[PDB]
Design a protein around this ligand. Structure first.
Ligand SMILES: [Ca+2]
Ligand SMILES: [Ca+2]
Ligand SMILES: [Ca+2]
Ligand SMILES: [Ca+2]
Ligand code: NA
Ligand code: NA
Lengths: 827, 853
């Protein structure tokens, strides 16, 4: 036999507080037992950035003629490896694999010890220098023990496989395949070898076989190129039809195999056109898909291969055919699944936000680019290599004196990296992701890669949705020879927030759906936009509710929207997967019904809604959605798209009416038109309502807008789940009224000052109830602090048919109010 | 009069603070918190470090309060665990001992007149030998884990210094259908330097519009004085009687006035009932024999520690009411007023106790602290009509097996004499409620006569779980009834544990499957329902709850809940609902399962066997599969059951054809062919499936290899201490503990008659502790056993791993997941063999996946 590879994940010990573990040390008290993948930042997300030590003892008797390697799939950010007390290898860069040769350091006794010093603290010379994703530290990807013979495919070529496959000619009826081999001989004698190259669909069928003789001098290495000309009878690879092959490579000495290594192969040719976009195998197709971050709360980035497959499966069932690996190279499993499932892939190294001037940052960046290209060279799913994302974002934060020099270093580094891609891989495109900032225009940076990618957020971070088409049409107009691609577009959503009046940045489900519908449509309407990737597949941990699915991978409405917009299978399903409750405060004493707007995601011409299995109405689908306006009797109801479906269970909903004249047998989110449904105890906070005589609601005031967006987006201190309640508010309300019957009520007022910072004597006011003084003075900025919530809870007894009148008494500045709850209690 | 507002906002917390007594403006290194708060919400979970922080934590806060002439200001702490020292503007202002009862702190002597105030609280949840709970099966969460209130009164007021009680104590010494007497005992205080002539108004009310009785009493208190005054409302008419079924509630409004102006006011609950416990027939209330059936409830909710909202208390008790419960035991400690108000309003008879668990410390300091805690519980919760039982010890002899022999005699006498003193105090403080004690299956109670001291003998019993078989429960209790015809018997605890990811067609005790819990619960409940001398039973426990020292399937969590930690009902909850509810009940089981996977037992197999059950109190019910009738089943003891054999695919289940108001249950059903192609995951050593929710990965129960198929070859399933598998915490993993914990010992290997191809293969293996132990969480480092369990692994004659020293290179409880790819050729199938060197190989799980290369 030839090459052996097993997992090396088990039996490790970890400590965040060890000073030095280089020398063999049997101590384990105080160390944490871990099984890789591991990150030490899975829970503390500031989060700990620093040194962490791993150590392990293991048994391995070195046999004659064998070589032993460790392959680390990923250590963030730098690693130093020590075997039996001796330095054995180091690596810089948290996103690419590396190999360590154990053989020089093994004990003949078989008793081995290894330690790894990992460090994820900031280094000016190692990107990512800053970004809005977490830099989880540790050995967060698996580790493998590899045994080979002393003649083997190289282990020292930037962590790549040492086997590099190229298809310089591909037609439907034949192709040329060239395979470039890096071979190493570790023995002290010259050696004569044979190299068997087989192109296979599977173990029983081969499409081409080649046999190559090679002789290597003692301690030698050599590069040999093998060509399979005019291969035939293959299927072409495309996202739609991802026909996959592989190259079996057997290195033999004396007819006995001494190494072996299979690599993927797909047959395809492709190009990008400025007017019509992406063509693969002569066919024009729209690339629509998603970015995907390699993290999942509460596990950090220490993900199982099962999790990788689940993610990419979700993308494929969405109808996606396009995958951007966020800002870094990802696990082999991810690329294997893309080959297998059918995604065209954009992969980049993590030069994000900013650049460090100088040759150390240049060198580390160059090495990382070569590692990515070499390590993922053979994946047919990859069509784009990139190397900078939003590289000017941090200009706003830098001293203006540095800006000229940073632009010069950015231009110079981009040209070096562009040149390296084009030399290492002439058969893929280069790209860069830019964003809505004038520095790209002004420096001409977008002229350097083959593809101009734009991260655009019109209607979310700036402007309105239609400004997206305006922006892209103007780019196409200025640059009719560029290839345009939307590398990021998306809006956020909290699956507890719902509004019949969604608005920019409110984080409601409906707002994300409308954003996603508009931009995707505007992309579909434009052939010159080669494609688009939603930011982001799933909610992730950042600095982040931007996913089409939740952190634990459950689809939101927007996911089903994209499935209706993208899938070729027929699609028709109800929206609101995370909502089952509707509550409506009556707008007049004669109200008896709850208004319920329902929607479905479909690619059919029309769809019909059934209530309790009786037809409600047929509705026309436009841009992936159908919609019905229902007025329902309060109670439970079943919704469905067919009557008495034989295979689809109905959706159960619960709709309630609050009477116009309340009795408190009353929860309101002030300052916002969305409901907040608190999942801990099923507590439904209503959208705001102004008080009117005979009813209940807030009196006076203005809704808070900050930077032109509703409410504050700052983190509300001291509470986790209730931030969307506190973040919206009325400024300068006179109070709150409710025409309650006589009785005793528990009353809650939620209040917070918006941008620990203390601002005394700035915002002070009193609260009274029916002339009774409750809190003579609340100093929100002073005694609590900016972003520190204040929850005033108390009981009051309404007497003499007075109703309930809560009054604010300004002392300094203006009162604020974020939410109100009123409950009837017995006493 | 009286003003009360929440005081929960604006606090700062630090676990690393030496001392914050003196007013100090810095906030660097402090966490902003909103009470309720505990610092043990996260470090009690599976965080890689057994144990949690018990020690000092400091809180501080600045606040505005301008003291008004003629006002007093108090803080009321609803609970701080375990001790609290309060400092206002640098001065000691109060301290409390005990983590489960409220306390008041008078702010007034320490307030700055100009209004800018500083407060710091030093809290501590270290172990203290003189302060129970000393040890227990629950977590001692530290901090101010219940709300704090700012209370303003006049200078004459209902006392704030009577063991934290309201200073208003309502008793109904006579309750009759045609009339009742209510006596209200008031403790008053005068902080004025002058004597005061006061009036006191006492009104019994249904609501603000309706008075049942009214009294007006003149009280004069001396300067700086205090007094107790008793008010009697005789022959109150026109009330409705309180019972769990009909919880008619009233309250006593009390106003204290000085020259007609209100200086204090405080309402308190009031319900009218009479009740008794009978040795032969059980509980009677208002003349009607009713069976008390309900649950224990702990005050925690993972992952929030015990820092719960009042919304969460209401949700817990509403769940119990919807289960058909009419009986609540507050686990081992007094709970929040909200719990008790909701018991009054919803209708549960309540048992409440102080946390003397497992053991007693000899000495007057322990005696004193437990005495105070008893007075605090009874006084603070005195007025709640829902309380019918007070208690003060729980399995008080449990820890004896672990104590030094020379301590036992004095521990036994300390226990006996403390139980007598606490019993005496209850009877003196509250003649109108019963005393009880929870005992467990241990002969100590019989030897000492401790069970003769309370009026009610409670048993925590676990037949078919910890000892014996289910039917030994009725034998145990019948013998108790025969031996003690004068006692009152009540099952204060019974339950079994379940993980909602574990399922078996062959349930067995301690596999933690859902089905075993349902079967345990069904058997003991109906045995209780058959015995009128058993006045009642409380399930252990309403919800899965934090108990950090636990191991088993899910470390740190006691999984005996009827509902999960986030309050979702398991099967056993719906079983209890079917056994207890008066409303009609009929509903499908398996709320946490939608997948069934079956390995074909022969090449002709085409159908997946699916056993379905439903919970009902009807005579029979009908199962419908894809809305066609499958079959009508008779209901026996709350359950109907059906044996289906279904074609692989998605199917609908329902109890009515095309229900107009109930969505069907959708299930997903799959058959692994007799001969596999790996397009295959097995829990070795166990008859239960493990459904890993992170990724919906379903590990089949074990199946022995036979020619032409796949499975484990040789070996014996591991049993330790009478329980399947090992119950130790499997290190380095969390979700997969129940997968690793079961295994075959000395297997030859594994086989799969797979087609030619490349396959990814995973073998999961762990060296185990050979002898069970009481507490498996105190290991200081890893236990290595080199040279004891050594073997090699080959596949089809190819050497994969020349030697693995499981005990030596990994260690006891350290998982080893061996993952690799192998290419099957030459029609050979897949043959994985172990090669013993020392000791025997082990194997907990196998997974095989076809890959392309
Ligand atoms: Ca139906
Ligand atoms: Ca927050
Ligand atoms: Ca811990
Ligand atoms: Ca574990
Ligand atoms: Na708000
Ligand atoms: Na197992």
């Amino acid at each position: 036999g030839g090459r052996c590879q097993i997992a090396f994940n088990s039996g490790w010990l970890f400590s965040k507080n060890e000073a030095n573990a280089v020398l063999p040390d049997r101590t384990t008290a105080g160390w944490q037992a871990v099984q890789l993948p591991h990150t030490w930042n899975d829970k503390d997300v500031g989060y700990y950035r620093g040194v962490g030590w791993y150590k392990k003892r293991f048994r391995l008797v070195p046999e004659k003629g064998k070589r032993y390697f460790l392959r680390f799939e990923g250590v963030n950010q730098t690693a130093e490896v020590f075997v039996n007390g001796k330095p054995a290898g180091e690596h810089t860069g948290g996103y690419t694999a590396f190999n360590v040769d154990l053989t020089p350091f093994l004990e003949a006794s078989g008793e081995q010890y290894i330690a790894v010093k990992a460090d994820n603290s900031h280094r000016d010379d190692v990107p990512p220098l800053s970004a809005d994703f977490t830099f989880f530290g540790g050995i967060y990807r698996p580790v493998h023990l590899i045994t080979t013979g002393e003649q083997h495919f190289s282990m020292s070529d930037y962590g790549g496989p040492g086997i590099y496959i190229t298809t310089p000619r591909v037609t439907p009826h034949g192709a040329d395949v060239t395979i470039t081999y890096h071979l190493q001989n570790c023995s002290d004698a010259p050696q004569a070898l044979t190299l068997e190259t087989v192109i296979r669909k599977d173990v029983a069928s081969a499409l081409a076989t080649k046999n190559t003789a090679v002789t290597i001098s003692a301690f030698g290495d050599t590069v040999v190129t093998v060509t399979c000309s005019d291969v035939r009878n293959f299927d072409l690879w495309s996202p739609d039809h991802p026909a996959m092959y592989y190259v079996e490579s057997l290195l033999k000495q004396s007819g006995k195999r001494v190494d072996n290594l299979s690599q993927p192969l797909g047959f395809r040719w492709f190009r990008f056109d400025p007017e019509k976009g992406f063509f693969i195998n002569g066919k024009n197709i729209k690339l629509m898909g998603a970015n995907r971050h390699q993290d999942r709360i509460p596990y950090g980035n220490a993900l199982s291969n099962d999790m990788h497959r689940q993610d990419l499966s979700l993308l494929k069932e969405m109808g996606g055919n396009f995958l951007r690996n966020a800002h870094y190279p990802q696990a082999d499993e991810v690329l294997d699944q893309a080959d297998r499932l059918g995604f065209a892939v954009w992969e980049e190294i993590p030069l994000v936000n900013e650049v460090t001037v100088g040759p150390r940052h240049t060198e580390n960046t160059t090495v990382m680019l070569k590692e990515m290209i070499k390590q993922h060279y053979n994946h047919p799913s990859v069509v784009i290599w990139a190397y900078m994302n939003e590289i000017y974002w941090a200009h706003r934060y830098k001293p203006q004196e540095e800006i000229a020099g940073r632009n010069r270093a950015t231009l110079e580094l981009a040209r070096r990296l562009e040149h390296i891609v084009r030399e290492l891989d002439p058969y893929r495109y280069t790209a860069m992701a830019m964003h809505n900032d004038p520095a790209y225009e002004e420096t001409g940076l977008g002229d350097i890669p083959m593809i101009a990618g734009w991260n655009l957020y019109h209607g979310w971070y700036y402007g309105i949705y239609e400004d997206f088409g305006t922006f892209m049409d103007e780019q196409r107009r200025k640059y009719p020879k560029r290839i345009h691609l939307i590398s990021e577009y998306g809006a956020g959503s909290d699956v507890r927030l719902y509004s019949e009046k969604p608005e920019k940045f409110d984080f409601t489900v409906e707002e994300q759906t409308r954003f996603t519908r508009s931009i995707t449509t505007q992309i579909l309407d434009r052939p010159y936009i080669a494609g688009g990737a939603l930011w982001n597949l799933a909610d992730f941990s950042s600095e982040n509710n931007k996913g089409l699915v939740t952190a634990d991978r459950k689809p939101k409405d927007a996911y089903y929207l994209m499935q209706a917009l993208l899938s070729e299978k027929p699609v028709a399903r109800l929206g609101y997967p995370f909502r089952n409750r509707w509550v409506h405060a009556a707008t007049s004493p004669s109200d008896t019904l709850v208004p319920v707007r329902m929607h479905a995601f479909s690619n059919q011409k029309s769809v019909s809604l059934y209530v309790d299995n009786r037809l409600f109405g047929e509705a026309e689908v436009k841009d992936g959605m159908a919609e019905w306006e229902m007025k329902l009797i309060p109670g439970r109801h079943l919704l469905s798209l067919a009557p008495n479906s034989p295979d689809t269970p109905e959706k159960q909903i619960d709709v309630r009416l609050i009477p116009f004249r309340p009795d408190g047998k009353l929860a309101m989110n002030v300052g916002a038109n969305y409901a907040f449904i608190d999942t801990r105890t099923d507590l439904y906070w209503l959208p705001e309502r102004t008080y009117e005589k005979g009813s209940w609601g807030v009196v006076g005031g203005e809704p808070l807008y900050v930077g032109g967006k509703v409410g504050t987006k700052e983190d509300i201190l001291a509470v986790d789940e209730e931030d969307p309640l506190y973040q919206t508010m009325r400024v300068n309300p006179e109070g709150f009224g409710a025409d309650l019957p006589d009785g005793t009520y528990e009353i809650e007022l939620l209040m917070v000052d918006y941008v620990i910072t203390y601002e005394p004597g700035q915002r002070v006011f009193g609260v009274s109830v029916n002339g009774t003084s409750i809190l003579p003075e609340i100093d929100l900025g002073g005694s609590y602090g900016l972003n520190v919530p204040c929850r005033l809870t108390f009981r009051y007894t309404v007497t003499d048919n007075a109703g309930l009148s809560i009054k604010f008494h300004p002392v300094s500045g203006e009162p604020v109010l974020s939410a109100v709850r009123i409950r009837k209690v017995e006493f």
